[PDB]
Design a protein around this motif. Structure first.
Motif, PDB file in Angstrom:
ATOM      1  N   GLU A 156     -11.388 -20.537  -4.578  1.00  0.00           N
ATOM      2  CA  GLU A 156     -12.603 -20.378  -5.390  1.00  0.00           C
ATOM      3  C   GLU A 156     -13.570 -21.549  -5.163  1.00  0.00           C
ATOM      4  O   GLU A 156     -14.715 -21.532  -5.614  1.00  0.00           O
ATOM      5  CB  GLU A 156     -12.279 -20.170  -6.880  1.00  0.00           C
ATOM      6  CG  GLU A 156     -13.459 -19.737  -7.747  1.00  0.00           C
ATOM      7  CD  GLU A 156     -14.026 -18.384  -7.351  1.00  0.00           C
ATOM      8  OE1 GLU A 156     -13.303 -17.592  -6.711  1.00  0.00           O
ATOM      9  OE2 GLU A 156     -15.199 -18.113  -7.684  1.00  0.00           O
TER      10      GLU A 156
ATOM     11  N   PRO B 223     -15.884 -16.358   2.120  1.00  0.00           N
ATOM     12  CA  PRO B 223     -16.074 -15.189   1.253  1.00  0.00           C
ATOM     13  C   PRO B 223     -17.327 -15.301   0.388  1.00  0.00           C
ATOM     14  O   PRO B 223     -17.908 -16.380   0.276  1.00  0.00           O
ATOM     15  CB  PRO B 223     -14.822 -15.204   0.371  1.00  0.00           C
ATOM     16  CG  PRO B 223     -14.387 -16.626   0.360  1.00  0.00           C
ATOM     17  CD  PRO B 223     -14.703 -17.148   1.728  1.00  0.00           C
TER      18      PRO B 223
ATOM     19  N   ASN C 241     -17.320 -15.008  -2.716  1.00  0.00           N
ATOM     20  CA  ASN C 241     -16.803 -15.320  -4.043  1.00  0.00           C
ATOM     21  C   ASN C 241     -16.918 -16.803  -4.383  1.00  0.00           C
ATOM     22  O   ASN C 241     -16.876 -17.184  -5.553  1.00  0.00           O
ATOM     23  CB  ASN C 241     -15.346 -14.865  -4.167  1.00  0.00           C
ATOM     24  CG  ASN C 241     -15.221 -13.430  -4.653  1.00  0.00           C
ATOM     25  OD1 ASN C 241     -15.816 -13.058  -5.664  1.00  0.00           O
ATOM     26  ND2 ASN C 241     -14.459 -12.614  -3.927  1.00  0.00           N
TER      27      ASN C 241
HETATM   28  C1  LIG Z   1     -13.166 -13.188  -3.651  1.00  0.00           C
HETATM   29  O1  LIG Z   1     -12.763 -12.871  -2.329  1.00  0.00           O
HETATM   30  C2  LIG Z   1     -11.376 -12.914  -2.076  1.00  0.00           C
HETATM   31  C3  LIG Z   1     -11.113 -12.638  -0.600  1.00  0.00           C
HETATM   32  O2  LIG Z   1     -11.496 -11.317  -0.291  1.00  0.00           O
HETATM   33  C4  LIG Z   1     -10.679 -11.888  -2.951  1.00  0.00           C
HETATM   34  O3  LIG Z   1      -9.302 -11.860  -2.650  1.00  0.00           O
HETATM   35  C5  LIG Z   1     -10.876 -12.266  -4.409  1.00  0.00           C
HETATM   36  O4  LIG Z   1     -10.364 -11.236  -5.227  1.00  0.00           O
HETATM   37  C6  LIG Z   1     -12.348 -12.503  -4.753  1.00  0.00           C
HETATM   38  N1  LIG Z   1     -12.463 -13.276  -5.982  1.00  0.00           N
HETATM   39  C7  LIG Z   1     -11.428 -13.810  -6.630  1.00  0.00           C
HETATM   40  C8  LIG Z   1     -11.107 -15.247  -6.331  1.00  0.00           C
HETATM   41  O5  LIG Z   1     -10.756 -13.188  -7.452  1.00  0.00           O
END
Ligand SMILES: *[C@@H]1O[C@H](CO)[C@@H](O)[C@H](O)[C@H]1NC(C)=O
Ligand SMILES: *[C@@H]1O[C@H](CO)[C@@H](O[C@@H]2O[C@H](CO)[C@@H](O[C@@H]3O[C@H](CO[C@H]4O[C@H](CO)[C@@H](O)[C@H](O)[C@@H]4O)[C@@H](O)[C@H](O)[C@@H]3O)[C@H](O)[C@H]2NC(C)=O)[C@H](O)[C@H]1NC(C)=O
Lengths: 210, 214, 668, 225, 224, 217, 215
Positions: free
Chosen positions: C5, C22, C24
């Protein structure tokens, strides 16, 4: 500082217009563009390089990069014809201006000059003076050649004339004065104002008999 | 209890060199550690206490550092008489445990030995046993290959060599090889030779004496 | 590139920003790389970033457009780069910036107003640069700035014109350390809206310039002041004059090589609470030198006085009643000094003193009489630290005046004598006594008679005499919970030594010679000194040379949770030795000589263990010796450190150096 | 002038009682603890334990608990160390030292001269000294050397001197070698210039403490046999 | 909105002191989020920067090198204005002066003054001579009839011409002033009005001249 | 709260031995050591020794090294002190003391045991009435405890009810060898023939409890 | 072995006065000194410990002072119930040694006359062939009192024995029990028996008598 703008730039009505503003690494500062019409006060049209203030048309866009600060006016109208100045505060100089840019908007079809000749008033003769007034209005282009005739003999003595300026309807006009004495006014049989426009001539004439 | 182990075990350094001996403790003995110096045959001498403190009357070239389980004794400029066995001791427990000590030697340059061979005195021959004594005077290094020769034949096993300490000045060892033989074996032979092979000699010098002629 | 993260790509020598991260992530850490540029196009898809750290790079400049790519950016770290020049377009579009770090960028001077639209900025750091001035704007902005750091620069003056841009701002901290400032223009401090903390560390000022400085701070809102290492050699009653008109509560005057402290030097700070005077060179502290400081609650005088001149006999002399004004002083730290001794009226006045540190404060405090601590009589002292004072003798009634004393540290001294019990007279509220690391203590039955309310007693490495007394010297200590007797190498103790200590919970007996006492050959059998310790929780018996363990020594130890029998010669243990240890949670048997682990021994022991420690043992790899042990290991919940590593067998030679974890129990 | 002097070298058989002394002088004897140190030949220093001369409080090392008895005499200012029954492995060098508490730890500043304890099943025999001299005409270099061989003696030590301790530099006493029989052999030489023929008298003096024997001998080369 | 009223002498003699006054409305002189200043435009389309003024804690004003030490911008917190003082003026100091408002952050001028004109001449300021102009004998079929006003001999510039005091707007044109050989200015201002409402509609012209304190209104008598 | 109880008195034969009991109640017996004290009438007190109830360790006085033998029954919570080879010089009072939170104190004492070495066996007390021949404002009654051995006896009045106005005199030793104690009680005349007056003499060695009523009135 | 030398022998001081007992230690015992009060019969009650500290429940008038080997017990303003024997002790080194002991009796600024009574031998006592007449002197002061028996106006000598109780807790007055023992022969030989009380409490020597057969 040193900011350089192009002297004169012309453009066809409704065409993409571009204005330059040169300077050493001017891409590091926020540039401003002001518009100014003769007889009026300069008004800011561009601040923060690309922002349009309250009451500013969307035809005015701007940009600034490297050594060049460029203004852009798409869909140039006849009302857009004016002066343009670029500015930036920079050092403790606190506001630095450029050379200035003159925009020229083409025709606008040619028109016939309205020539009106006003003789000296009676009260002017009461003060023992005379002055013939030639007043032209609504003509394009502004390039005219006015001549004063005493009967058949040309007279250029005691002649004062202004340079042709533009009106509110984007047509040009000017005023002329010929200072003489009431004696000479009651001497020659006829005085004539002959205005040459694009070769052709529009003429007015007055006589002692009035 | 507490195990004190030093490193290295023995080293060699020239006069004027800066030497560092390390002392490791099995567990944290804190700041309580002493450095003692022992000359051959003589009682130890207190150099350092509390790991960094310099004991009164101790030369200025001796320093000490470290804490926890790591300590270090440092000799600034080595001296010809600074060769000794340096032990470290812990005092964090009433059961003082020393290290195995560190042997300090001097890296003097190569020096050839002065060979002198001595035949048995007659007063010894009166007893019924003869002992010939070979002497190597002042040399370096320790590695000396002393080979006796009875009538041009290499003897072995019946020789016992003693090596002295490094000289207090020039730092040179001295070797004495004692060869023992019966009285019957003395008059039985003719040529008694002492050959010395060393790194300070290109060709092994052989000092000899003949039985009766000496 | 590690994703958690928070994208961390530190120390990768990246010459370009990763494009496989990513969508995220919200934080990007790019410390120590080789980035020269930072294009906006490489930051488009990552518009969710709220924190960016690109410290230690070679970044030349910053694109304005880039600031548009991160509308959620809060913290931006640009430390130690090559970002030398800034413009108004640089941080313009980053309005949500709350923290901006710009250290060691070799910035010589800032142009116009680069931080005019950073009105959300709380902390601005411009340290280790080349700024010669403090002007960062020509208008009023940054109303939310609370910390302005300007460390290690070439700033020579503070001008009102340059500092009045924060007129509507409230600065909690104004850092100006390592700056050679030689003049303070009048009104510069009032130009700021709210200035609470001023830091002028490593700034060559002097008494005069510091005086003018204090005059400039007058009538302000200052609370914290640090003038550390300003080489303030002397102080008079005119030096801190202006500070009379302030509500200052924290003053740092450390590392100033302060020689003389003139009378009423700090009479202008009746609101000061925290006084730092550590590390100085004071040769003589006069009486009224500390006058007016009646609100100070903490005073630090560590190494504040001159060292002994050895030859000149120049001892730092402290006049009597020199601390009488600090009526609200609660914490006094005078450790590490060369004070000749404790005068009759040295600490007279401190009626709120609860902590006194005299650690190595005196040249030689060789004898503690009944008149030594007479000045502390009217002080509610709870903790007294008397370590490293070369104390060699403690006379009777020496602590009569410290009736409220709770913690007494007499460790690290030369205390060598007989304890008669009168040494502790007056200590009615005593809690713990630290007596570790000394010469020798001869014990008697009346040694600890006068202090039965003691809970913690430390006698580590002090050579206890008569500790093997029949009426135990520890008998009156009923409330004792922690007893340290380690490093004493005591070869003999008696059965009833720990009698009367029913409330004992922690017992340290490591590094002693109790081995002979537990062998069966010992006259009168083994000494069961662990008899009646029903509340013992932690037992330490390491480094004793134990080769035998009697079966019933650990009988009355039901609440024993942690047992330490490592570093002994233990090998074979008798059956049912740990049969009464049901609450055992930690077993230590490392570095022993254990060669067999059977059920009849470690059965009830391995019941609810959570920490097993038998690291260095010469196990025997046969069925009847290791089967039960391995079979227990394979199914246990017990955390076993270095399980696969250091659990090697030394016998039989077929399994030499073979991990016990990989032993086959199918043959048994 | 702090000085610690122990007893002389002891030579006993395994099973005999022994008690070595250690007297101090020039300092406050009952003010500083007195510790003992054993050093086996070729091995490191080992701690035995300490005692307070005042109250005779003894603290032995865990290794020597019940294996030795440290005592002290406050009157004579003399700490003693004794064995009730000597052993084959008790053969070592024994030092005594003063424990000075500095830097918050016990350190040993002043030491004894050392007591050599030699315990074996063998008996004592007086040394046999015989001189060493090169041939007659073989000496014509720069410097020559003469010798003294103290052979067939037990046990150590043996003190070798030249001209009653007058001659210092120039001499070399070699370590003693153990012969096949069980007796020792020591070589002790001396170097002199070319005036070694008939200029000065070089007489070696050897003293053997255990057997109480002192022998002197002049060294010169005899031409006939 | 924010309005700036600028005033001052149109004529300043050489080696003396030029003074100007700019009053503000819709904003305060002594406050942030508002900067002020002066900028003149010399005849010939030469836009120059005189100075700016602003307040943070003290009063901070910045000038050019061109204005040297001859300029001085002092604000009046009392009457909400800001003045301009230019000592020792030469004929090249003659310009079209504009008082300006700079808007933070980046200094842009969203609000200018209408601008006042000053002149350095060491004259005495002559008053204009306005006379009405209309055809003596007008009897035509034209749907247009142009009547006007003629200004004669005045100094210095400029003069403002109105019609019916602001009522008549569209159709009004004022011609640029000329400079006679006598050193004075002449100006004309005409307007076209219907021929059917010649004698049934009133047409009066206004004339304002600043440095002469002269305001002359004249009615044009329609000729039948 | 906490009591150490010893027997009343013990009559013994010269040469023989006798154990003395000290029962500890009110607390945990295995806490504090039990000390013993020998006190002769009028003379000073001597500290006999201290004994540990845990391991039975004993610190003796060099005088009582061969006279006193200390033991402790932990299950019975009792300290026992055996005196051997009894002489008349051993006849005294023996106390068992304990220590408190301050071990340098003797807070808890037992009521002591009176050892009497005589070889004369035990004779019970002969209780006789004592009433005047006379009235007056205050009259006096009493009991005479004559001829008993050895000390002591306990004389109560009306089962412990009558307390004030009672003088129980110290016993005296006659030429016959038997002790003779006198006890009296002063009561107003108006209460002579109205209520009952009975005295209770209790002699511990003879196991004798006599209740003698003084009539007359 | 450290001894304890207690001073003085005995002590007599009236109410309200201040008394001071002294203890001399043969050796150093520090402050470990115990002062006990003991009334005749009961086990010793602890008064002072550690020389300066009072026992829990002990009145404020008792206070100890310490100096070198001199340890003193000081009572300010005595009270009638402060009588009995006072002993001292050390707790330094075993064996513990006590003091010789100082007996404290009080006095009062007044004189109380004895209530004199006489008790004839019993009707059950004369069966034994032994008669005992008991003269009682109830509640008096001071101690000094002369009881003289009279068998038909003839003074008896040696055959009478006195027994006096300890001082009173409140009023500090003693009682005396004189016993005239005569065999049944010597008793039945005469008729009138008397006891004569000569004391400073009564005006003239009071003689209380009885006749044989009367009772
Ligand atoms: C953000 O991306 C990752 C990689 O695809 C994914 O596994 C994850 O569920 C997403 N966010 C989070 C940390 O939950
Ligand atoms: C009374 O004053 C005493 C000072 O005279 C106090 O002693 C101080 O107590 C502190 C806290 O316990 C101790 O400092 C400890 O140091 C150890 C070891 O330090 C390690 O430091 C680095 C680590 O890499 C390295 O140098 C070594 O590996 C060391 O092992 C730390 O583990 C502790 O956390 C702690 O910092 C010292 O004992 C001492 N400090 C000083 C100032 O000398 C004593 O605490 C006071 N008594 C009380 C309780 O009031």
């Amino acid at each position: 500082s040193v900011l350089t703008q192009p002297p004169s730039v012309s453009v066809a009505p409704g065409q993409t217009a571009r204005i330059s503003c040169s300077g050493d690494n001017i891409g590091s500062y926020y540039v401003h563009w002001y518009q100014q019409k003769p007889g009026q006060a300069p008004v800011l049209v561009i601040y923060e390089d690309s922002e349009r203030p309250s009451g500013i048309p969307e035809r005015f866009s701007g940009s600034n990069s490297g050594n060049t600060a460029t203004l852009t006016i798409s869909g140039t109208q006849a009302e857009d014809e004016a002066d343009y100045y670029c500015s930036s505060y920079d050092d403790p100089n606190f506001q630095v201006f450029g050379g200035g840019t003159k925009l020229t908007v083409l025709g606008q079809p040619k028109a016939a000059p309205s020539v009106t000749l006003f003789p000296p008033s009676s009260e002017e003769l009461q003060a023992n003076k005379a002055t013939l007034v030639c007043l032209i209005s609504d003509f394009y282009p502004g390039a005219v050649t006015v001549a004063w005739k005493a009967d058949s003999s040309p007279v250029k003595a005691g002649v004062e004339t202004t340079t042709p300026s533009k009106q509110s309807n984007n047509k040009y006009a000017a005023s002329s004065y010929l200072s003489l004495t009431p004696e000479q006014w009651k001497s020659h049989r006829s005085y004539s104002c002959q205005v040459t426009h694009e070769g052709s001539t529009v003429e007015k004439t007055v006589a002692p008999t009035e | 209890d507490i195990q004190m182990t030093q490193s290295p075990s023995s080293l060699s350094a020239s006069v004027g060199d800066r030497v560092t001996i390390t002392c490791r403790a099995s567990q944290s003995i804190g700041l309580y550690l002493a450095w003692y110096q022992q000359k051959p045959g003589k009682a130890p001498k207190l150099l350092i206490y509390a790991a960094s403190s310099l004991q009164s009357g101790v030369p200025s070239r001796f320093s000490g550092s470290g804490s926890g389980t790591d300590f270090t004794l440092t000799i600034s400029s080595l001296q010809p008489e600074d060769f000794a066995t340096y032990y470290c001791q812990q005092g964090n427990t009433l059961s003082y445990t020393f290290g195995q000590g560190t042997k300090v030697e001097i890296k003097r340059t190569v020096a050839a030995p002065s060979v002198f061979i001595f035949p048995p005195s007659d007063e010894q021959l009166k007893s019924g046993t003869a002992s010939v004594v070979c002497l190597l005077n002042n040399f370096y290094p320790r590695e000396a290959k002393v080979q006796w020769k009875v009538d041009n034949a290499l003897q072995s096993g019946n020789s016992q060599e003693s090596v002295t300490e490094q000289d207090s000045k020039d730092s040179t060892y001295s070797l004495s090889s004692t060869l023992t033989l019966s009285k019957a074996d003395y008059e039985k032979h003719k040529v008694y030779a002492c050959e010395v092979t060393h790194q300070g000699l290109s060709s092994p010098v052989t000092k000899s004496f003949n039985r009766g002629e000496c | 590139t590690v994703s958690h993260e928070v994208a961390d790509c530190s120390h990768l020598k990246l010459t370009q920003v990763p494009d496989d991260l990513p969508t995220n992530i919200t934080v990007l850490n790019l410390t120590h790389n080789q980035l020269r540029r930072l294009p906006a196009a490489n930051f488009t898809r990552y518009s969710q970033l709220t924190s960016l750290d690109v410290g230690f790079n070679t970044i030349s400049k910053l694109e304005p457009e880039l600031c548009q790519k991160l509308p959620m950016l809060k913290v931006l770290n640009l430390q130690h780069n090559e970002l030398s020049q800034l413009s108004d377009k640089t941080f313009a579009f980053c309005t949500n910036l709350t923290e901006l770090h710009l250290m060691s960028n070799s910035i010589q001077k800032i142009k116009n107003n680069p931080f005019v639209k950073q009105k959300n900025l709380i902390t601005l750091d411009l340290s280790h640069n080349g700024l010669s001035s403090t002007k960062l704007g020509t208008q009023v902005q940054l109303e939310n700035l609370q910390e302005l750091l300007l460390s290690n620069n070439k700033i020579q003056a503070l001008k009102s014109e340059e500092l009045d841009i924060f007129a509507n701002s409230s600065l909690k901290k104004l850092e100006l350390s390592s700056n050679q400032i030689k003049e303070f223009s009048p009104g510069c401090f009032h130009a700021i809206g709210r200035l609470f903390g001023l830091f002028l560390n490593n700034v060559q000022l002097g008494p005069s310039l510091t005086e003018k400085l204090c005059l400039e701070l007058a009538n302000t809102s200052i609370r914290n002041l640090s003038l550390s290492n300003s080489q303030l050699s002397t102080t008079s009653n005119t030096t801190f004059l202006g500070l009379k008109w302030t509500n200052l509560t924290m003053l740092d005057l450390s590392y100033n090589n302060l020689n003389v402290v003139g009378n009423d030097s700090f009479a202008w700070l009746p609101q000061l609470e925290y006084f730092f005077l550590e590390y100085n060179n004071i040769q003589h502290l006069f009486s009224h030198s500390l006058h007016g400081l009646f609100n100070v609650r903490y005073l630090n005088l560590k190494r504040s006085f001159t060292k002994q001149s050895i030859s000149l006999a120049s001892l730092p002399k402290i006049d009597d009643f020199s601390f009488q004004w600090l009526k609200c002083l609660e914490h006094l730290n005078m450790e590490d000094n060369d004070i000749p001794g404790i005068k009759s009226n040295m600490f007279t006045g401190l009626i709120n003193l609860k902590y006194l540190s005299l650690s190595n404060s005196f040249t030689s405090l060789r004898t503690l009489t009944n008149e030594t601590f007479v000045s502390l009589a009217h002080s509610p002292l709870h903790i007294l630290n008397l370590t490293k004072n070369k104390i060699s003798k403690i006379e009777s009634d020496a602590f009569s005046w410290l009736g409220h004393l709770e913690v007494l540290d007499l460790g690290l001294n030369e205390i060598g004598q007989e304890l008669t019990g009168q040494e502790w007279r007056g200590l009615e509220n005593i809690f713990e006594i630290y007596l570790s690391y000394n010469k020798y203590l001869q014990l008697t039955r009346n040694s600890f008679a006068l202090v039965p309310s003691l809970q913690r007693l430390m006698l580590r490495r002090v050579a206890l005499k008569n500790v093997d007394s029949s009426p135990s010297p520890f008998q009156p200590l009923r409330n004792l919970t922690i007893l340290d007797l380690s490093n004493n190498n005591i070869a003999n103790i008696n059965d009833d030594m720990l009698e009367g200590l029913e409330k004992l919970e922690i017992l340290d007996l490591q590094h002693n010679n109790l081995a002979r006492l537990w062998k069966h050959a010992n006259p009168g059998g083994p000494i069961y000194f662990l008899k009646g310790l029903s509340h013992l929780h932690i037992l330490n018996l390491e480094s004793n040379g134990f080769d035998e363990i009697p079966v019933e020594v650990f009988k009355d130890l039901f609440e024993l949770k942690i047992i330490d029998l490592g570093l002994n010669n233990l090998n074979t243990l008798p059956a049912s030795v740990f049969n009464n240890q049901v609450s055992l949670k930690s077993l230590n048997l490392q570095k022993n000589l254990i060669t067999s682990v059977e059920k009849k021994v470690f059965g009830p022991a391995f019941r609810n263990l959570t920490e097993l420690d038998m690291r260095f043992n010469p196990f025997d790899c046969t069925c009847e010796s290791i089967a039960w042990f391995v079979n227990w290991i394979n199914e246990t919940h017990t955390n076993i450190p270095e399980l696969s590593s250091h659990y090697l067998c030394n016998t039989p030679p077929h399994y030499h150096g073979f991990p016990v974890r990989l032993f086959d129990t199918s043959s048994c | 002038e702090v000085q610690l002097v122990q007893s002389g070298a002891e030579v006993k058989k395994p099973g005999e009682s022994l008690k070595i002394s250690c007297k101090g002088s020039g300092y406050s004897f009952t003010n500083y603890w007195v510790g003992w140190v054993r050093q086996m030949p070729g091995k490191g220093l080992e701690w035995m334990g300490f005692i307070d001369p005042s109250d005779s409080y003894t603290n032995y090392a865990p290794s020597f608990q019940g294996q030795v008895t440290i005592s002290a005499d406050k009157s004579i200012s003399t700490a003693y160390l004794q064995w009730s029954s000597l052993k084959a492995s008790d053969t070592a060098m024994y030092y005594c030292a003063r424990e000075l508490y500095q830097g918050y730890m016990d350190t040993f500043d002043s030491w004894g001269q050392g007591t050599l304890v030699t315990v074996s099943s063998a008996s004592t025999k007086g040394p046999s000294v015989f001189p060493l001299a090169p041939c007659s005409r073989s000496t014509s270099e720069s410097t020559a050397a003469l010798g003294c061989l103290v052979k067939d003696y037990f046990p150590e030590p043996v003190t070798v001197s030249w001209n009653s301790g007058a001659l210092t530099s120039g001499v070399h006493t070699f370590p003693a070698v153990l012969q096949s029989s069980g007796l020792y052999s020591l070589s002790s030489v001396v170097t002199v210039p070319s005036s070694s023929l008939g200029t000065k008298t070089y007489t070696c003096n050897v003293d053997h403490k255990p057997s109480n024997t002192k022998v002197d001998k002049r060294v010169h080369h005899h031409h006939h046999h």
